[PDB]
């Protein structure tokens, strides 16, 4: 499987207050993320979390003090999800119901997505209670996905990984991972490369100065809709570096993975 995530929160605020909190961009930025423009019927917008993560949004309907219906794509490359935020007033509280569906969603994604929406509605409730910002500053793990056609090119082959990953060999076997932007470091040591052809890829990326290594898992899951290529890159919060160093690394690597997923989509065309 059931791709349809449904989450609810009940808050002791009136419907009009909750509606403002989920539509006014100044308020939305206190608990959810930064909107490039308010949601408007038939118009596109974008929400940015300040850490490299974002969704591109197309808004289908805005019904005041009732509901928001929109579609979005994680990092601009993920499959389109149908999202609904619906308010129901009560004698005790206002209920916000979140619907998030996506045809063919891997069952492996559903639990993470439910937890993600429970986090977001928990931040809404905190902001309504205290008036203080309840945003997270940066998310401790990187993830993303893109749906590829069921074609002849596959991203998880020794002879295709260099087509889309920012890696180079170091003797014989991938040994460097590159983050190419206007900051540094640019070159990172890659260790423990393990490729299970057309199934899964794991490796570690060392961070200069850090107390532990980061861990990367790439997988493909077949489906009627196409092959879902997914990445998880973890460890940023346990590097033993300053928070700004950890956040900056996470942000830069998130942009790198966004570019890699896009390139894989181009290769699979
Ligand atoms: Cl292989
Ligand atoms: Cl596959
Ligand atoms: Cl942890
Ligand atoms: Mg944590
Ligand atoms: Na934090």
Residue numbers in the entry: 9 to 277
Show me the paper's own sentences about this structure.
Here, we report, at a resolution of 1.5 Å, the crystal structure of DynU16, a putative di-domain protein homolo­gous to StAR-related lipid-transfer (START/Bet v1-like) domain-containing proteins. The enediyne core is synthesized by a type I highly reducing iterative polyketide synthase (iPKS), yielding a linear conjugated polyene upon release from the iPKS by a thioesterase. While an actual enzymatic assay is needed to confirm the speculated function of DynU16, we conclude that it is likely that this protein participates in the biosynthesis of dynemicin as a cyclase or perhaps at least as a dehydratase of an extended or cyclic ANQ precursor.
The final model included 269 protein residues, 282 water molecules and five ions. Residues 0 (left from the tag after cleavage) to 8 at the N-terminus and 278–283 at the C-terminus were disordered and were not modeled. The N-terminal (residues 1–139) and C-terminal (residues 150–283) domains are connected by a flexible ten-residue linker (140–149). Assessment of the C-terminal domain suggests divergence from the canonical START/Bet v1 fold observed in the N-terminal domain. The C-terminal domain possesses eight instead of six antiparallel β-strands and has adopted additional loops. The opposing region of the cavity is composed of aromatic residues, including Phe57, Phe63, Phe82, Phe128, Trp80, Trp125 and Tyr144. The abundance of aromatic residues localized in one region of the cavity suggests a possible role in carbocation intermediate stabilization if cyclization is catalyzed in the cavity. The cavity-forming residues frequently reside in loops or β-strands, potentially increasing cavity flexibility and enabling contraction and expansion to accommodate substantial substrate rearrangements. The shape and size of the cavity appears to support the binding of a linear or perhaps a cyclic polyene.
